[PDB]
């Protein structure tokens, strides 16, 4: 299980040397009083680390040097308790690459109306303290998330925690590696992209291996390791009796063991396969992909590493109780006028986290790629609102298209449909949302997620400086059309 | 053994309907008198086709539509015999994608000083005829090659023939397809690129197949086919006797037959392999690659499809008597002050077209990629001037770096060097040319060619509208730096 | 007396994990053999530090992270001994801000013609090793200096040592701070600039203090410190006898002690004054400024902090045997047709490092700013070639104009001219060079230097990514005109 907990966020308080050493300790004590009570709230998925109050420029750059060196650091929260002049922060901000969150707050809620004096205004320079700081950010063209509100309020705490999840989701991508077993499906364009621009912009390291490398590991698996997987399969899934149905289960278990060993040996965070190139593999890898995705490993099919990396990062985001992130492909539509829906599924690989029922193992005739009927997990989709994202390469840059959707319970049964399925409504209308998905050039391979909001992906794209286009409920098609071309030039030369 | 005499070039003469029908037939007859004598000259590698003199705009667009419809047409040569207004050419030029050559010429060399009358100035309106025509090209931002001179002169004929060779080299790339057996070498950047923008800009269709697909073909080869290859090997090459050296020759022969069968079935023009992904292949492809390159198939190693496609197109260019094009890798330097050279070779694959002596088959221990000692062709390089080109992906666009070099004869013999090799001097100085190659970001995999001049690649880049940077003798390093940065923005927004 | 020696340069050797651990030790030992012999050469003004050969991406980023943290590191020298794939370097190059020098070299000069085998070719993969590396720089648009040649040759060593001096000149500016005593001269434009954009681009921290701050320190100077300065003055300079001339010497001595106390307390590297705002100061700072400039402190007059910072960095460059850097103001011309010259001087402040004769203390009536006759050093200019540079603010960016000049000996003496003076010829012609200086918008305050070449400032501007325009002998006025407009948009949008 790869779940975030080790990542820490560096809370940063600012001051200057042109102050008395007595009032600085009051700021240090108050900052401890804020960050410790912040750690008392269980909403934050990671710890906070208060660092000594900064007064000179050299201290600023010294702390930022340590922020980029420690891999356990995945973000910095900056808050000006008092007036800290910004020209001290220039050299420090010109070196850091960790995401920034600008917390605008004052520790005391109300104003002591009868006791506000000049010795208190000198301490609580909150209003005009970071306004000068935000100028230096807007000036340096630096990407950051701004959040305003009193730290005791819940709304600001939710915003800063969502930013924490995103600020570490990019880190599980700068460190990790994406593995390709076979190249892209031939003549497919949306799955292709510039592998170097991903390392330069997103940080996603990406490499390709021949599938025979996997075929070496799938056969060299011990026999008493697949039975410990079969007892787990029985405790959670499994089809009737010992027939040819269980032969595919043992084959999928042997592939699962090979994949876990391989991805562990090469520090992987996501992987992708191809269905027309898996020789010496006795069967198309199914169920094992769902087993690896159930932990956290992102996956894309047909060579699509775009979707694999997006699914991995967006799975690092949605990691808590309302979890549910899967690799999706919009498969078919339901064109009734009043209740037009869309049924999403794949040929085999759908993550069992968005499942509503008991994940049921099934095997069915599947001639795609020409092997033996592979196993798969079957379940109905989850209810409620969700998001459907897709990153696609635009030649000179990447763009992230995201559609907010409302998933609905399945009304009718499907006896002959072998793969797990979800039904949802694209907001606002199927016609508008789908014609906007087509205008933006969104790929067919998407990242379905019920655990996160559009706020998450918006902070992801803001932190990585890539184009984002959202398809909210207030979607006006013509204004979205203008938005596409106005964005096309901003991200082209500037970034 | 695919050659290029089938391609034809469409000669296009311009006039207008606002003229007498009598002098238009004089223009038609004069154009026939020029084009027939043009076909009589054997310097041109392809035929010319005179099409009826154009007078109206609809005729213009009709001819250009047939130019985009006929696959045998690979270029259009435009010449204004009389004043043809350009606004008729606007709709015709706004639809064609075939390369344009602007022939500026007068059918008669001298001026009839004693017989120049108004019926002759009205006929031979060449001087101010295409001056108006070139304006609509500069205006429409249309790429074309401009050539001025009398068609009887040899210099102009050399220029137009080089343009013909390039204009058919691009067609063997818009139609053909490049095949990849395995992806790129892991973590390598200069060999990687955007496969979609390559189809959009250059037209090179590109796809990837698993190496097991080739391992299927290598084993089902008939037996009486390998000895028919060994007799041809003996007629030209071959190593002593059957011990362990003749086994690898038959292994390479069955690989050659498998590659021929595969590449012919999928309309291929170039192919690329990888040394760390050759599962079920008993031996690294060597001699067979050189055998295919000797005919015309372009090749790149370690997944480099950039070099493979460039080698294929530049082999289509250099196709006649002074032939000599190979896939090269700058392997090692010779740093003596007065006679500093560079030794280029590969691990196995060097085309036997640049060979000077008899290609000698040799087998030597080669542990790269972990297979059985493969066979290879050994020979010394050719003398005289040559060029060394490389196309590389710059994120938003491709750029073509080309170095003019002077090859020198090999002074000493190399008993322990197993691969064929070439020695050359980069113009003007090794320091200047190599530091400019590094500034421009040229790949290590290059396309060495002795059959063509820099004019060829310059018309290639002019016709495809990609950045080209030359390393001529007139190389001033600081101006080259400024050239790189000034070019980065013209090809950035405009194209 | 602040010079350089503490700065260290990190030599960086590249390889990959996909190699045998035995042949990696050969590279480590060979790199030690190169860097130790490099430290044996006294041409290099700073030390070299070999760091373990890098094989994985994480080691790359670890080294670059520590390079930005250690303040003693002022540059990184990169050299690919073997083929190191570039995608490993992406995360490492995307974090460092230290200047890069790309050393292209092979440890052995000639080629072992009779002993070149695959076990030697696998070791010295230098030729095609860093070509792949330079591609990742061209791709990431990262600024760097490329140097090609064998490390035993002296010319390449001269290039790399000049880059070392420049790479540490920028560090004494990212850390240091510039002090202003009074603002700019009123209504003057060329001295003005954006104090924030200087910290963002050049790193120069800049702040202003009232002149009364200096007037407090000038009066509380101990008495037995100024006579201890007068004895040294006698050892080097001094005017006849104790009269009104020595009163100004004691005034300059107390000003010098006050400046020494002030600038050291606030980590200063340059300072600037103004002549129309010196309240409570009994005398305009003269001789004391020359005494501080003789050590290393940069200085600009009339509030010009551009010239002060430029003089400081350009003094850090020219610090060894051929020393000689001063603050200059193009003061008057000599308009004879064949020998048109320009006489450069100021009202008081000319550095005694460019002096040819014995610096003679003199006092003369000077009504500028309304104080008491200040002291000054008088001497004739130096011979040989020199450069005259000037950085100027262009609204959105800075540009660096530099004029190559040839200094000439003074033919006649000037009895009534009170300030030290230099005579030189602007290359190629005074008309061309001065009309190009006016076209480029060069300020009247310049940085005259005899210790450095144009190569130094060209690497300064290349490392800081600012526009540079040179006025060498190869000055073509029309080409310079086009160069200005082509640079304006490249440095306007891109950087
Ligand atoms: Mn699919
Ligand atoms: Mn290679
Ligand atoms: Mn691209
Ligand atoms: Mn002045």
Swiss-Prot record, chains A, B, C:
The protein's Enzyme Commission number: 5.3.1.4
Positions contributing to Mn(2+) binding: 302, 329, 346, 445
Pfam families: AraA_central (PF24856), AraA_N (PF02610), Arabinose_Iso_C (PF11762)
Alphabetized Gene3D superfamilies for the sequence: 3.40.50.10940
Protein's UniProt keywords contain Metal-binding: yes
Cofactor binding, note field: Binds 1 Mn(2+) ion per subunit.
Keywords attached to this entry: Arabinose catabolism, Carbohydrate metabolism, Isomerase, Manganese, Metal-binding
Entry's Gene Ontology cellular component terms: cytosol
Gene Ontology terms: biological process: L-arabinose catabolic process to xylulose 5-phosphate
Free-text function comment from the UniProt entry: Catalyzes the conversion of L-arabinose to L-ribulose.
Protein name per Swiss-Prot or TrEMBL: L-arabinose isomerase
Organism name: Thermotoga maritima (strain ATCC 43589 / DSM 3109 / JCM 10099 / NBRC 100826 / MSB8)
């Amino acid at each position: 299980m790869i779940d975030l907990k080790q990542y820490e966020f560096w809370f940063l308080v600012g001051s200057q040397y042109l102050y008395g050493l007595e009032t600085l300790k009051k700021v240090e004590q108050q900052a401890s009083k804020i960050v410790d009570s912040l750690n008392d709230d269980p909403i934050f998925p990671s710890k906070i680390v208060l660092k000594p109050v900064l007064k000179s420029s050299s201290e600023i750059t010294e702390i930022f040097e340590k922020a980029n060196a420690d891999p356990k650091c995945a973000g910095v929260i900056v808050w000006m308790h008092t007036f800290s002049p910004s020209k001290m922060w220039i050299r420090g901000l010109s070196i850091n690459k960790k995401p920034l969150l600008h917390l605008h707050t004052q520790y005391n809620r109300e104003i002591p109306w009868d006791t506000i004096d000049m010795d208190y205004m000198n301490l609580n320079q909150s209003a005009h303290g970071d306004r000068e700081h935000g100028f230096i950010h807007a000036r340096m063209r630096l990407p950051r998330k701004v959040v305003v509100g009193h730290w005791e309020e819940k709304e600001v705490r939710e915003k800063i925690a969502k930013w924490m999840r995103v600020a570490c989701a990019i880190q599980d991508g700068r460190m990790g590696q994406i593995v390709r077993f076979g190249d892209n499906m031939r003549e497919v364009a949306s799955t292709e992209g510039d592998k170097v621009e991903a390392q330069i912009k997103l940080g996603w390291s990406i490499n390709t291996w021949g599938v025979g490398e996997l075929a070496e590991r799938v056969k060299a698996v011990p026999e008493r390791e697949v039975e410990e997987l079969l007892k787990e399969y029985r405790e959670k899934y499994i089809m009737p009796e010992d027939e040819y149905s269980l032969k595919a289960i043992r084959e999928q278990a042997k592939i699962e063991i090979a994949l876990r060993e391989f991805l562990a040996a090469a520090n992987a965070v996501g992987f992708t396969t191809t269905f027309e190139d898996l020789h010496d593999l006795p069967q198309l890898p199914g169920l094992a992909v769902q087993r690896l995705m159930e932990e956290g490993y992102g996956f894309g099919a047909e060579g699509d590493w775009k979707a694999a990396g997006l699914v991995r990062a967006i799975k690092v985001m949605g990691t808590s109780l309302p979890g549910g992130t899967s690799f999706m492909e919009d498969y078919t539509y339901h064109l009734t006028p009043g209740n037009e829906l869309v049924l999403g599924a794949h040929m085999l690989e759908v993550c069992p986290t968005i499942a509503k029922e008991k994940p049921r193992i099934e095997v069915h005739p599947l001639s795609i790629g020409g092997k033996a009927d592979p196993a798969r997990l079957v379940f109905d989709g989850q209810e409620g609102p969700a998001v459907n994202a897709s990153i696609v390469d635009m030649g000179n840059r990447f763009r992230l298209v995201v559609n907010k959707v409302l998933s609905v319970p399945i009304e009718r049964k499907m006896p002959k449909l072998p793969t797990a399925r979800v039904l949802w409504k694209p907001l606002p209308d199927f016609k508008r949302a789908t014609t906007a998905w087509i205008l933006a050039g969104g790929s067919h391979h998407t990242a379905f997620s019920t655990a996160i909001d559009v706020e998450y992906l918006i902070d992801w794209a803001e932190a990585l400086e890539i184009e984002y286009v959202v398809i909210d409920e207030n979607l006006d098609l013509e204004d979205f059309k203008k938005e596409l071309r106005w964005n096309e030039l901003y991200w082209g030369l500037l970034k």
